[PDB]
């Protein structure tokens, strides 16, 4: 029977009224892009931005009660699927997604750790 989340996904789908002809207009946001990449690493350099997006989305909708059960339900499953049930991973990810790119101190701290960040961007052979 369908994975717990599809139910809730389609439920949300109604709420947003996403199942109407028009939605089909203008290419596709994710689906296609995500189709150009099969090497897992790459699939992850994109899925990351796609999860952070659904993350903002559901956030700007917590103030709403009518779809809450659906939105939490989808979320857990996303955790179990993308963050492979790894509590750290989620938590690290979260942290990174919430950094005031305008907090005048956050931009110094980051400009500081740039060179170091860049020197581990590429994949290693001996880790």
């Amino acid at each position: 029977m369908q994975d717990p989340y599809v139910k809730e996904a389609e439920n949300l789908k109604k709420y947003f009224n996403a199942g109407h002809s028009d939605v089909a207009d203008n290419g596709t946001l994710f689906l296609g892009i995500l189709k150009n990449w099969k090497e897992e690493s790459d699939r992850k350099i994109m899925q990351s931005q796609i999860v952070s997006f659904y993350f903002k989305l559901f956030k700007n909708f917590k103030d709403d009660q009518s779809i809450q059960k659906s939105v939490e339900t989808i979320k857990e499953d996303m955790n179990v699927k993308f963050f492979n049930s790894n509590k750290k991973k989620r938590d690290d990810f979260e942290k990174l997604t919430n950094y005031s790119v305008t907090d005048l101190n956050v931009q110094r701290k980051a400009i500081h750790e740039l060179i170091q960040v860049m020197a581990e961007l590429s994949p290693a052979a001996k880790t």
């Binding site: 029977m1 369908q2 994975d3 599809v6 199942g19 109407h20 002809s21 028009d22 939605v23 089909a24 207009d25 203008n26 290419g27 596709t28 689906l31 296609g32």
Partner: protein
Amino acid sequence: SVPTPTNVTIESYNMNPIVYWEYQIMPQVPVFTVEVKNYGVKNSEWIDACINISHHYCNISDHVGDPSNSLWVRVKARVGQKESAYAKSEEFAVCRDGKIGPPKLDIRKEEKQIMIDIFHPSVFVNGDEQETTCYIRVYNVYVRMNGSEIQYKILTQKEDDCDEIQCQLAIPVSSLNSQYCVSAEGVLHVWGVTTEKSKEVCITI
């Protein structure tokens, strides 16, 4: 009721859906035009699947892209030169909303073990040259022997028994009894729709 098509309905089997719609009878024979729009449209234009048709059905097979990408079809009529407003089908998704033919079973023998070959359903087993998350995830091999049944799951993905063509499932020559009967259904990625359960291809006594 007046000049608009009614009860629009798409339906699919083995991956080829046909749009169906009613219409009131009247002294004049009208024609119809069914148009398909499938998610992920470059701009916003619909597509003419069957135009100025006299019947009440339409095989839209050449508008079924990735069998997982929802599509909406609309239909209208023309009475002489008096067309009408369109009729809208609900979002259709071939993989969620259709039904598929059974897999192809093969039983045989090897020393202490019966071997079972489950050839993926016709549709999938093609090669993509002639006319997706829409695939079989678990095959449910049922095996009946004496009067007792027992099923077996099987993950076409995380398992190296299956391959683009078939799947394997050995069996120990069980409970003193021969005359084993195999049947098998597929289950799909995402909606969990079963395929048709093949007819039994028993073995021995």
